[PDB]
Amino acid sequence: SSLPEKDIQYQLHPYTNARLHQELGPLIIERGEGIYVYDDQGKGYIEAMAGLWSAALGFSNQRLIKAAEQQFNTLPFYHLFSHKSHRPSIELAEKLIEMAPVPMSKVFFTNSGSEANDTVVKMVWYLNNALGKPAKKKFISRVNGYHGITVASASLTGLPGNQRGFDLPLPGFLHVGCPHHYRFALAGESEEHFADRLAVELEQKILAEGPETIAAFIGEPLMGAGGVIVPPRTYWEKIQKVCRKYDILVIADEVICGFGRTGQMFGSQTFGIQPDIMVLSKQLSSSYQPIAAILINAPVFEGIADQSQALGALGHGFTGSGHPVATAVALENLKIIEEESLVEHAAQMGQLLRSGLQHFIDHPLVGEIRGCGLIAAVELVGDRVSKAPYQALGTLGRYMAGRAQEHGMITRAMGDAVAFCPPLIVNEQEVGMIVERFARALDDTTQWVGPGG
Amino acid sequence: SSLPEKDIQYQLHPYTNARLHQELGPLIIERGEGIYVYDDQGKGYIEAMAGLWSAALGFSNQRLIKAAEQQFNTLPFYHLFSHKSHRPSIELAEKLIEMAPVPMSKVFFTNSGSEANDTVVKMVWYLNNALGKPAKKKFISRVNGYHGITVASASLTGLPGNQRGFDLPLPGFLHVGCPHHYRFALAGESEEHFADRLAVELEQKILAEGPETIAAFIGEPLMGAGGVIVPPRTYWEKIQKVCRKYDILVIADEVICGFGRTGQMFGSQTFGIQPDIMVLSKQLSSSYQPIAAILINAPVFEGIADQSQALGALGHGFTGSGHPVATAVALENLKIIEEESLVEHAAQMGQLLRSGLQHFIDHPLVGEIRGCGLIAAVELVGDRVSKAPYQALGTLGRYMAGRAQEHGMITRAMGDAVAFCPPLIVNEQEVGMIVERFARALDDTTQWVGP
Ligand SMILES: Cc1ncc(COP(=O)(O)O)c(CNCCCCCC(=O)O)c1O
Ligand SMILES: *Cc1c(COP(=O)(O)O)cnc(C)c1O
């Protein structure tokens, strides 16, 4: 019984067509080193996604591995319930609060981004009950946002693939437009006027729903899984004025943007967001351990704290909340990002990545090249004027990604956009290789389609 | 500035009164070894809870620590999305399926129990939509059950502490009786007749709701966080006959019971449960890594698989699903439990624990002593005839737990019950020490309550 046969036999894979998987089986990844991973045939791939937008320090950072060992050999597991605590969680929470781009009060730890956002939802409901506003419960998020996949966080999420078949979203989870100019702007509309229209949409939703019923607005500073969607100029400024106008919390989902991905330490800095709550994960630990953190500002903490007293204790927490190994690894991870000036380095590598891709700006199949910092995407189209896909939506993206993999590079297609989110430690010449392999995949795709013109 | 001051300054603690925490600060745990943990003053405590019902191999197992190192140095992170895979997840899934107490088809991994049960809820909804039964969505769980704390898993949960202030439960999450004879039986009613009445309650709920609307029944074989509640004789047999009668899935939440806690490898074995779905965590990895697993049987998998094809892909998964380090650690963990025959050893230590606690059966504040295997609780009361609490429910439990800690033992109070769920590696004399420290806490509690 071979290893692929066992995988087919025993594992139900996430984000995978189960029947198709029974036919093709897995691609088994055996080992990692630097920005590379190698399959069970010995073939090497540049992991241009950093796994899942996450492996900031790459796939063989010994300092993270040692930090884990040291913590294992001290205290391999403990918890934070009932006043219990431990050093790694305490020092990580300290670090996170002091590096926060706006004044923050407290950290709450979870294992995952989905748990974190699920927890934010509950916290907001608990908060507003504590403040005597029991109607103020609804969340507003965006079409194509991704915020995880619990019953509640999938309701925040605005990708239909996370909702069809699942009876989601739940009631009370509202959606407004995807701020993607290329796709949803009217013909000859400015970024700024698009932003205006989106802010008016949101004010209109709030009034139709009754402002007293709206608790919070949540958004990724720029949307990751939904297509590396950079919001238009002035979006965040104008969306926030609306939120403050009706006393609505602003939650920044920084699970992908956090820790140097967008050219600065947080997407909230890059895009001028003053969030009341931040959600962090992925680069927090370069995914070497599962860990997420929620940062809450003073007003949010004080209301929650009052209620936890009235009710005896805060009735919430995961067994793994603040896990000493995961928190110890994250702490070292963050120190490395500081000590090696990887935010600034990522910004530079991001400029290289983008320039390299921009040699293809006038290619007949390239509709848009977008990104900032060290996150980017190239959205392919069948026709540039109409912006229509070749064959069905997704066809080009799937073909590109398959070619890229053939050429030793792992990228994820989101419809017809192919994404780049490489490790922060990527060096100049590695950026070159990434772009080369993108180009070879585009070439193959171009021969396959035969654009002519 | 000092480490407690930082914790107070920067951390919001789960299951903690936040204001009281701003006053007292934390109890900082610095290191662990065997069944013990030590605070930052050097004081040692027997961890009679095994942390959170979870640290099966204790707090310094080098084999788990090595397995982690070896995996870290091979592949420290990867994922299972889009047909990607890796050895540890594959070999763990294999092991879990082959050791399952009933035929199972597939494993799906999450980080936590709460995520797991949340995922089970979605899977059941996805399944029944696939089968063209869009009305069949409601879950039935029990009062005082605990199944985690996401918006959906907290709705499954039946402890009001997890719901007050959170606008839970959601609609479609139904609750039937806690199967706790001591509290809910009528006078002089047998365990068997109590079980009959509970099965009738469930059939009646199903009919009142419309059977076509009921997707699933979920239960911990015995309830952990709700008070170490052992169901009465014949409960599970009779509850299952009702569920099969209306084609209702039976989900066993084995997050605590799993891997030797109840005298056998699974609570499903100990209590005669034939679940369609099982949820595992905690002792899965001795909590050295965050990991949970869902085991689904063939019919559940086949329906989901069909739908994931129709819809392009199964639109669900956590970044950490099947994390190579966490799965590698769990795999080694399970091997150790087998190689060291810890299920059988835990059973023996459980007999010692329970007989040691029984010396207090006639104490004026002891209302009930319960448990099986290596899980147990002593429920204190202010008055044995009336079963009423001293002052208010929880007052005794909070005092006991504080005294136990003073006497070098960490136990958790669930209301006025104090629990025992020590590491499986606990030895005979350590069981004695646990019982002795319980006894010293009870003495203190007894003098405190006074005349
Ligand atoms: C039976 C059961 N099922 C699910 C979960 C959730 O696990 P997670 O914490 O999400 O990984 C649990 C968890 N147990 C911890 C006990 C907390 C209850 C409060 C208390 O101990 O008083 C369990 O047990
Ligand atoms: C991947 C992701 C999540 C969910 O994280 P998990 O740990 O996979 O639950 C949440 N938010 C964003 C923006 C993400 O990209």
PDB file of N, CA and C in Angstrom, chain A residues 7 9-11 13 15-16 18-19 21 27 29 47 59 74 76 78 80 82-85 89 94 98 106-107 112 115 118 122 129 137 149 151 165 167 287 289 302 314 316 323, chain B residues 6-7 9-11 13-16 18-19 27 29 32 47 59 76 78 80 82-85 89 98 106-107 112 115 118 122 129 137 149 151 167 287 289 302 306 308 314 323:
ATOM      1  N   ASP A   7      -3.459   8.093   1.196  1.00  0.00           N
ATOM      2  CA  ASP A   7      -4.064   9.410   1.241  1.00  0.00           C
ATOM      3  C   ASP A   7      -5.474   9.387   0.641  1.00  0.00           C
ATOM      4  N   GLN A   9      -7.324   6.742   0.309  1.00  0.00           N
ATOM      5  CA  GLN A   9      -8.120   5.860   1.162  1.00  0.00           C
ATOM      6  C   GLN A   9      -8.670   6.564   2.421  1.00  0.00           C
ATOM      7  N   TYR A  10      -7.871   7.424   3.038  1.00  0.00           N
ATOM      8  CA  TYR A  10      -8.152   7.826   4.411  1.00  0.00           C
ATOM      9  C   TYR A  10      -8.432   9.310   4.675  1.00  0.00           C
ATOM     10  N   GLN A  11      -7.956  10.210   3.809  1.00  0.00           N
ATOM     11  CA  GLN A  11      -8.122  11.660   4.014  1.00  0.00           C
ATOM     12  C   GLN A  11      -9.170  12.316   3.135  1.00  0.00           C
ATOM     13  N   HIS A  13      -9.845  15.850   1.882  1.00  0.00           N
ATOM     14  CA  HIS A  13      -9.025  17.059   1.746  1.00  0.00           C
ATOM     15  C   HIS A  13      -9.842  18.321   1.691  1.00  0.00           C
ATOM     16  N   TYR A  15     -10.739  22.102   0.490  1.00  0.00           N
ATOM     17  CA  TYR A  15     -10.610  22.849  -0.756  1.00  0.00           C
ATOM     18  C   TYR A  15     -10.162  21.933  -1.882  1.00  0.00           C
ATOM     19  N   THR A  16     -10.814  20.787  -1.934  1.00  0.00           N
ATOM     20  CA  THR A  16     -10.529  19.793  -2.941  1.00  0.00           C
ATOM     21  C   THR A  16     -11.825  19.080  -3.390  1.00  0.00           C
ATOM     22  N   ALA A  18     -13.527  15.977  -4.031  1.00  0.00           N
ATOM     23  CA  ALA A  18     -13.229  14.647  -3.469  1.00  0.00           C
ATOM     24  C   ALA A  18     -13.164  13.507  -4.504  1.00  0.00           C
ATOM     25  N   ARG A  19     -14.064  13.537  -5.487  1.00  0.00           N
ATOM     26  CA  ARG A  19     -14.099  12.506  -6.539  1.00  0.00           C
ATOM     27  C   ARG A  19     -12.901  12.635  -7.447  1.00  0.00           C
ATOM     28  N   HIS A  21     -10.132  13.813  -6.628  1.00  0.00           N
ATOM     29  CA  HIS A  21      -8.984  13.401  -5.825  1.00  0.00           C
ATOM     30  C   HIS A  21      -8.851  11.877  -5.788  1.00  0.00           C
ATOM     31  N   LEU A  27      -0.620  15.387  -4.557  1.00  0.00           N
ATOM     32  CA  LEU A  27       0.754  15.742  -4.782  1.00  0.00           C
ATOM     33  C   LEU A  27       1.350  15.801  -3.396  1.00  0.00           C
ATOM     34  N   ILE A  29       4.056  16.527  -0.723  1.00  0.00           N
ATOM     35  CA  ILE A  29       5.232  17.349  -0.420  1.00  0.00           C
ATOM     36  C   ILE A  29       6.007  16.710   0.720  1.00  0.00           C
ATOM     37  N   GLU A  47       7.994  28.046  -3.719  1.00  0.00           N
ATOM     38  CA  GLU A  47       6.680  28.205  -3.136  1.00  0.00           C
ATOM     39  C   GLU A  47       6.344  29.686  -3.159  1.00  0.00           C
ATOM     40  N   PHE A  59      10.814  27.757   4.658  1.00  0.00           N
ATOM     41  CA  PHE A  59      10.500  26.383   5.074  1.00  0.00           C
ATOM     42  C   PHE A  59      11.609  25.651   5.822  1.00  0.00           C
ATOM     43  N   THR A  74      10.647  23.064  28.321  1.00  0.00           N
ATOM     44  CA  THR A  74      10.303  23.811  29.518  1.00  0.00           C
ATOM     45  C   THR A  74       8.877  23.433  29.942  1.00  0.00           C
ATOM     46  N   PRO A  76       5.572  22.064  27.604  1.00  0.00           N
ATOM     47  CA  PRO A  76       5.089  21.743  26.274  1.00  0.00           C
ATOM     48  C   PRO A  76       3.620  22.054  26.021  1.00  0.00           C
ATOM     49  N   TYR A  78       0.293  24.286  28.224  1.00  0.00           N
ATOM     50  CA  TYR A  78      -0.529  24.761  29.324  1.00  0.00           C
ATOM     51  C   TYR A  78      -1.574  25.690  28.727  1.00  0.00           C
ATOM     52  N   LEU A  80      -4.644  29.175  29.437  1.00  0.00           N
ATOM     53  CA  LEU A  80      -4.804  30.524  29.983  1.00  0.00           C
ATOM     54  C   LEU A  80      -6.121  30.727  30.725  1.00  0.00           C
ATOM     55  N   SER A  82      -8.949  30.652  33.699  1.00  0.00           N
ATOM     56  CA  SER A  82      -9.020  30.846  35.155  1.00  0.00           C
ATOM     57  C   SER A  82      -7.777  31.450  35.762  1.00  0.00           C
ATOM     58  N   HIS A  83      -7.313  32.554  35.181  1.00  0.00           N
ATOM     59  CA  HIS A  83      -6.138  33.301  35.661  1.00  0.00           C
ATOM     60  C   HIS A  83      -4.799  32.603  35.409  1.00  0.00           C
ATOM     61  N   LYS A  84      -4.787  31.401  34.836  1.00  0.00           N
ATOM     62  CA  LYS A  84      -3.500  30.758  34.586  1.00  0.00           C
ATOM     63  C   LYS A  84      -2.840  31.497  33.443  1.00  0.00           C
ATOM     64  N   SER A  85      -1.518  31.549  33.458  1.00  0.00           N
ATOM     65  CA  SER A  85      -0.777  32.175  32.384  1.00  0.00           C
ATOM     66  C   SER A  85       0.611  31.575  32.269  1.00  0.00           C
ATOM     67  N   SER A  89       3.093  33.560  26.143  1.00  0.00           N
ATOM     68  CA  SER A  89       1.859  34.252  25.794  1.00  0.00           C
ATOM     69  C   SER A  89       1.953  35.692  26.267  1.00  0.00           C
ATOM     70  N   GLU A  94       2.489  41.340  24.848  1.00  0.00           N
ATOM     71  CA  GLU A  94       3.205  42.613  25.008  1.00  0.00           C
ATOM     72  C   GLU A  94       3.749  43.132  23.698  1.00  0.00           C
ATOM     73  N   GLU A  98       2.513  46.583  21.665  1.00  0.00           N
ATOM     74  CA  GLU A  98       3.418  47.702  21.518  1.00  0.00           C
ATOM     75  C   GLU A  98       3.777  47.965  20.057  1.00  0.00           C
ATOM     76  N   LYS A 106      -5.698  44.914  24.518  1.00  0.00           N
ATOM     77  CA  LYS A 106      -5.531  43.505  24.920  1.00  0.00           C
ATOM     78  C   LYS A 106      -5.460  42.562  23.765  1.00  0.00           C
ATOM     79  N   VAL A 107      -4.820  41.422  24.017  1.00  0.00           N
ATOM     80  CA  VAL A 107      -4.733  40.344  23.052  1.00  0.00           C
ATOM     81  C   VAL A 107      -5.511  39.126  23.548  1.00  0.00           C
ATOM     82  N   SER A 112      -6.831  29.533  15.027  1.00  0.00           N
ATOM     83  CA  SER A 112      -6.981  29.868  13.610  1.00  0.00           C
ATOM     84  C   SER A 112      -7.567  31.244  13.370  1.00  0.00           C
ATOM     85  N   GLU A 115     -11.418  30.796  13.739  1.00  0.00           N
ATOM     86  CA  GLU A 115     -11.775  30.912  15.127  1.00  0.00           C
ATOM     87  C   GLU A 115     -11.671  32.360  15.602  1.00  0.00           C
ATOM     88  N   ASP A 118     -14.610  34.342  14.294  1.00  0.00           N
ATOM     89  CA  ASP A 118     -15.772  33.800  14.956  1.00  0.00           C
ATOM     90  C   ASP A 118     -15.867  34.384  16.366  1.00  0.00           C
ATOM     91  N   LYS A 122     -18.629  37.005  18.426  1.00  0.00           N
ATOM     92  CA  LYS A 122     -19.162  36.813  19.761  1.00  0.00           C
ATOM     93  C   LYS A 122     -18.804  37.967  20.706  1.00  0.00           C
ATOM     94  N   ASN A 129     -24.405  43.830  24.205  1.00  0.00           N
ATOM     95  CA  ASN A 129     -25.264  43.448  25.291  1.00  0.00           C
ATOM     96  C   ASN A 129     -24.830  44.126  26.600  1.00  0.00           C
ATOM     97  N   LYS A 137     -26.277  44.217  16.496  1.00  0.00           N
ATOM     98  CA  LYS A 137     -25.645  42.918  16.335  1.00  0.00           C
ATOM     99  C   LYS A 137     -25.153  42.562  14.928  1.00  0.00           C
ATOM    100  N   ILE A 149     -13.959  30.090   7.800  1.00  0.00           N
ATOM    101  CA  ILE A 149     -14.961  29.124   7.410  1.00  0.00           C
ATOM    102  C   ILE A 149     -15.677  28.391   8.528  1.00  0.00           C
ATOM    103  N   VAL A 151     -19.102  28.381  10.773  1.00  0.00           N
ATOM    104  CA  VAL A 151     -20.448  28.789  10.424  1.00  0.00           C
ATOM    105  C   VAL A 151     -20.569  30.313  10.432  1.00  0.00           C
ATOM    106  N   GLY A 165     -24.358  25.307  -0.611  1.00  0.00           N
ATOM    107  CA  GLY A 165     -24.468  23.994  -0.010  1.00  0.00           C
ATOM    108  C   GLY A 165     -24.398  23.981   1.500  1.00  0.00           C
ATOM    109  N   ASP A 167     -25.994  26.418   3.574  1.00  0.00           N
ATOM    110  CA  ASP A 167     -27.060  27.300   4.106  1.00  0.00           C
ATOM    111  C   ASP A 167     -26.520  28.576   4.730  1.00  0.00           C
ATOM    112  N   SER A 287       3.340  30.266  10.002  1.00  0.00           N
ATOM    113  CA  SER A 287       2.571  29.027  10.002  1.00  0.00           C
ATOM    114  C   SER A 287       3.326  27.808  10.541  1.00  0.00           C
ATOM    115  N   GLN A 289       3.456  27.120  13.555  1.00  0.00           N
ATOM    116  CA  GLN A 289       2.500  26.651  14.543  1.00  0.00           C
ATOM    117  C   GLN A 289       1.183  27.308  14.286  1.00  0.00           C
ATOM    118  N   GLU A 302     -13.069  47.253  27.822  1.00  0.00           N
ATOM    119  CA  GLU A 302     -13.728  47.703  29.058  1.00  0.00           C
ATOM    120  C   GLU A 302     -15.176  47.172  29.163  1.00  0.00           C
ATOM    121  N   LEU A 314     -15.669  35.273  31.797  1.00  0.00           N
ATOM    122  CA  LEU A 314     -15.863  35.312  30.343  1.00  0.00           C
ATOM    123  C   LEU A 314     -16.010  33.893  29.809  1.00  0.00           C
ATOM    124  N   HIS A 316     -15.718  31.858  27.304  1.00  0.00           N
ATOM    125  CA  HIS A 316     -15.155  31.652  25.979  1.00  0.00           C
ATOM    126  C   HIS A 316     -13.673  31.318  26.095  1.00  0.00           C
ATOM    127  N   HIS A 323      -1.344  28.724  23.327  1.00  0.00           N
ATOM    128  CA  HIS A 323      -0.456  27.574  23.450  1.00  0.00           C
ATOM    129  C   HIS A 323       1.020  27.999  23.542  1.00  0.00           C
TER     130      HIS A 323
ATOM    131  N   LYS B   6       2.751  42.617  33.144  1.00  0.00           N
ATOM    132  CA  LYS B   6       2.572  42.547  31.712  1.00  0.00           C
ATOM    133  C   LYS B   6       1.328  41.742  31.335  1.00  0.00           C
ATOM    134  N   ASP B   7       1.098  40.640  32.026  1.00  0.00           N
ATOM    135  CA  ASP B   7      -0.025  39.802  31.709  1.00  0.00           C
ATOM    136  C   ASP B   7      -1.310  40.548  31.944  1.00  0.00           C
ATOM    137  N   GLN B   9      -1.621  43.785  31.965  1.00  0.00           N
ATOM    138  CA  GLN B   9      -1.641  44.883  31.000  1.00  0.00           C
ATOM    139  C   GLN B   9      -2.143  44.458  29.615  1.00  0.00           C
ATOM    140  N   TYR B  10      -1.742  43.276  29.161  1.00  0.00           N
ATOM    141  CA  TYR B  10      -1.842  42.981  27.750  1.00  0.00           C
ATOM    142  C   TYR B  10      -2.740  41.832  27.339  1.00  0.00           C
ATOM    143  N   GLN B  11      -3.005  40.882  28.243  1.00  0.00           N
ATOM    144  CA  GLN B  11      -3.824  39.690  27.936  1.00  0.00           C
ATOM    145  C   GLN B  11      -5.240  39.695  28.486  1.00  0.00           C
ATOM    146  N   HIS B  13      -7.890  37.054  29.295  1.00  0.00           N
ATOM    147  CA  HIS B  13      -7.890  35.612  29.563  1.00  0.00           C
ATOM    148  C   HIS B  13      -9.232  34.950  29.370  1.00  0.00           C
ATOM    149  N   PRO B  14      -9.224  33.772  28.763  1.00  0.00           N
ATOM    150  CA  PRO B  14     -10.458  33.031  28.596  1.00  0.00           C
ATOM    151  C   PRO B  14     -10.935  32.519  29.930  1.00  0.00           C
ATOM    152  N   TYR B  15     -12.245  32.306  30.054  1.00  0.00           N
ATOM    153  CA  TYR B  15     -12.845  31.691  31.227  1.00  0.00           C
ATOM    154  C   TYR B  15     -12.272  32.329  32.494  1.00  0.00           C
ATOM    155  N   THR B  16     -12.195  33.648  32.471  1.00  0.00           N
ATOM    156  CA  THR B  16     -11.686  34.404  33.577  1.00  0.00           C
ATOM    157  C   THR B  16     -12.490  35.688  33.733  1.00  0.00           C
ATOM    158  N   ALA B  18     -12.445  39.274  34.081  1.00  0.00           N
ATOM    159  CA  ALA B  18     -11.397  40.214  33.648  1.00  0.00           C
ATOM    160  C   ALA B  18     -11.029  41.263  34.700  1.00  0.00           C
ATOM    161  N   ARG B  19     -12.030  41.770  35.420  1.00  0.00           N
ATOM    162  CA  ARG B  19     -11.790  42.766  36.450  1.00  0.00           C
ATOM    163  C   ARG B  19     -11.050  42.177  37.641  1.00  0.00           C
ATOM    164  N   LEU B  27      -1.619  33.345  37.738  1.00  0.00           N
ATOM    165  CA  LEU B  27      -0.731  32.372  38.292  1.00  0.00           C
ATOM    166  C   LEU B  27       0.098  31.909  37.121  1.00  0.00           C
ATOM    167  N   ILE B  29       2.661  29.741  35.178  1.00  0.00           N
ATOM    168  CA  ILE B  29       3.248  28.418  35.145  1.00  0.00           C
ATOM    169  C   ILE B  29       4.497  28.476  34.281  1.00  0.00           C
ATOM    170  N   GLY B  32       7.009  22.259  33.310  1.00  0.00           N
ATOM    171  CA  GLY B  32       6.268  21.043  33.561  1.00  0.00           C
ATOM    172  C   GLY B  32       7.175  19.855  33.493  1.00  0.00           C
ATOM    173  N   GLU B  47      -0.850  18.118  38.424  1.00  0.00           N
ATOM    174  CA  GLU B  47      -1.859  18.619  37.500  1.00  0.00           C
ATOM    175  C   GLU B  47      -2.907  17.536  37.368  1.00  0.00           C
ATOM    176  N   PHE B  59       3.829  16.221  31.078  1.00  0.00           N
ATOM    177  CA  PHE B  59       4.367  17.518  30.671  1.00  0.00           C
ATOM    178  C   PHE B  59       5.852  17.505  30.287  1.00  0.00           C
ATOM    179  N   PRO B  76       8.432  22.066   8.000  1.00  0.00           N
ATOM    180  CA  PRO B  76       7.847  22.666   9.215  1.00  0.00           C
ATOM    181  C   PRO B  76       6.414  23.137   9.051  1.00  0.00           C
ATOM    182  N   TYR B  78       3.138  22.792   5.893  1.00  0.00           N
ATOM    183  CA  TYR B  78       2.510  22.723   4.601  1.00  0.00           C
ATOM    184  C   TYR B  78       1.030  22.473   4.830  1.00  0.00           C
ATOM    185  N   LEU B  80      -3.098  20.983   3.063  1.00  0.00           N
ATOM    186  CA  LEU B  80      -3.768  19.882   2.402  1.00  0.00           C
ATOM    187  C   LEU B  80      -4.765  20.338   1.365  1.00  0.00           C
ATOM    188  N   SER B  82      -6.280  21.657  -2.206  1.00  0.00           N
ATOM    189  CA  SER B  82      -6.052  21.442  -3.647  1.00  0.00           C
ATOM    190  C   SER B  82      -5.195  20.239  -3.967  1.00  0.00           C
ATOM    191  N   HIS B  83      -5.549  19.103  -3.378  1.00  0.00           N
ATOM    192  CA  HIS B  83      -4.825  17.837  -3.582  1.00  0.00           C
ATOM    193  C   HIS B  83      -3.413  17.773  -2.978  1.00  0.00           C
ATOM    194  N   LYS B  84      -2.920  18.839  -2.343  1.00  0.00           N
ATOM    195  CA  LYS B  84      -1.605  18.746  -1.713  1.00  0.00           C
ATOM    196  C   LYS B  84      -1.727  17.839  -0.494  1.00  0.00           C
ATOM    197  N   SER B  85      -0.649  17.134  -0.168  1.00  0.00           N
ATOM    198  CA  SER B  85      -0.640  16.272   1.021  1.00  0.00           C
ATOM    199  C   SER B  85       0.773  16.093   1.553  1.00  0.00           C
ATOM    200  N   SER B  89       0.151  13.576   8.004  1.00  0.00           N
ATOM    201  CA  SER B  89      -1.319  13.609   7.941  1.00  0.00           C
ATOM    202  C   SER B  89      -1.843  12.272   7.411  1.00  0.00           C
ATOM    203  N   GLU B  98      -7.975   2.972  11.221  1.00  0.00           N
ATOM    204  CA  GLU B  98      -7.820   1.568  11.506  1.00  0.00           C
ATOM    205  C   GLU B  98      -8.046   1.270  12.977  1.00  0.00           C
ATOM    206  N   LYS B 106     -13.257   8.222   6.382  1.00  0.00           N
ATOM    207  CA  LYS B 106     -12.302   9.314   6.181  1.00  0.00           C
ATOM    208  C   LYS B 106     -12.063  10.175   7.406  1.00  0.00           C
ATOM    209  N   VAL B 107     -10.899  10.831   7.411  1.00  0.00           N
ATOM    210  CA  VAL B 107     -10.542  11.811   8.430  1.00  0.00           C
ATOM    211  C   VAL B 107     -10.421  13.197   7.827  1.00  0.00           C
ATOM    212  N   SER B 112      -8.899  22.726  16.467  1.00  0.00           N
ATOM    213  CA  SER B 112      -9.580  22.606  17.743  1.00  0.00           C
ATOM    214  C   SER B 112     -10.842  21.744  17.707  1.00  0.00           C
ATOM    215  N   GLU B 115     -13.646  23.979  16.399  1.00  0.00           N
ATOM    216  CA  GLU B 115     -13.634  23.987  14.944  1.00  0.00           C
ATOM    217  C   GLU B 115     -14.162  22.667  14.385  1.00  0.00           C
ATOM    218  N   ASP B 118     -17.926  22.507  14.766  1.00  0.00           N
ATOM    219  CA  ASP B 118     -18.448  23.513  13.869  1.00  0.00           C
ATOM    220  C   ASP B 118     -18.445  22.956  12.445  1.00  0.00           C
ATOM    221  N   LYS B 122     -21.580  21.966   9.576  1.00  0.00           N
ATOM    222  CA  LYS B 122     -21.585  22.322   8.162  1.00  0.00           C
ATOM    223  C   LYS B 122     -21.631  21.080   7.269  1.00  0.00           C
ATOM    224  N   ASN B 129     -28.307  18.693   2.021  1.00  0.00           N
ATOM    225  CA  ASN B 129     -28.579  19.422   0.781  1.00  0.00           C
ATOM    226  C   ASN B 129     -28.239  18.573  -0.443  1.00  0.00           C
ATOM    227  N   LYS B 137     -32.000  19.722   8.979  1.00  0.00           N
ATOM    228  CA  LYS B 137     -30.861  20.533   9.386  1.00  0.00           C
ATOM    229  C   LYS B 137     -30.645  20.684  10.887  1.00  0.00           C
ATOM    230  N   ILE B 149     -16.957  26.329  21.509  1.00  0.00           N
ATOM    231  CA  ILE B 149     -17.388  27.695  21.712  1.00  0.00           C
ATOM    232  C   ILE B 149     -17.323  28.604  20.494  1.00  0.00           C
ATOM    233  N   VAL B 151     -19.559  30.177  17.444  1.00  0.00           N
ATOM    234  CA  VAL B 151     -20.961  30.521  17.395  1.00  0.00           C
ATOM    235  C   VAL B 151     -21.826  29.265  17.253  1.00  0.00           C
ATOM    236  N   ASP B 167     -26.050  35.837  22.825  1.00  0.00           N
ATOM    237  CA  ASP B 167     -27.228  35.595  21.963  1.00  0.00           C
ATOM    238  C   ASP B 167     -27.279  34.180  21.393  1.00  0.00           C
ATOM    239  N   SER B 287      -2.196  17.395  23.885  1.00  0.00           N
ATOM    240  CA  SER B 287      -2.199  18.852  23.778  1.00  0.00           C
ATOM    241  C   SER B 287      -0.817  19.453  23.560  1.00  0.00           C
ATOM    242  N   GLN B 289       0.358  19.758  20.672  1.00  0.00           N
ATOM    243  CA  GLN B 289       0.062  20.576  19.511  1.00  0.00           C
ATOM    244  C   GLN B 289      -1.446  20.706  19.372  1.00  0.00           C
ATOM    245  N   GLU B 302     -19.593   9.613   1.176  1.00  0.00           N
ATOM    246  CA  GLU B 302     -20.007   9.481  -0.216  1.00  0.00           C
ATOM    247  C   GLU B 302     -20.910  10.670  -0.633  1.00  0.00           C
ATOM    248  N   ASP B 306     -19.826  13.507  -3.435  1.00  0.00           N
ATOM    249  CA  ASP B 306     -20.660  13.836  -4.591  1.00  0.00           C
ATOM    250  C   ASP B 306     -20.860  15.347  -4.691  1.00  0.00           C
ATOM    251  N   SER B 308     -19.076  17.887  -3.312  1.00  0.00           N
ATOM    252  CA  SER B 308     -17.797  18.569  -3.603  1.00  0.00           C
ATOM    253  C   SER B 308     -17.412  18.529  -5.089  1.00  0.00           C
ATOM    254  N   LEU B 314     -14.718  21.072  -2.263  1.00  0.00           N
ATOM    255  CA  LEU B 314     -15.292  21.220  -0.916  1.00  0.00           C
ATOM    256  C   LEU B 314     -14.809  22.531  -0.336  1.00  0.00           C
ATOM    257  N   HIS B 323      -1.802  20.040   9.921  1.00  0.00           N
ATOM    258  CA  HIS B 323      -0.472  20.591  10.082  1.00  0.00           C
ATOM    259  C   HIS B 323       0.541  19.476  10.338  1.00  0.00           C
TER     260      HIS B 323
END
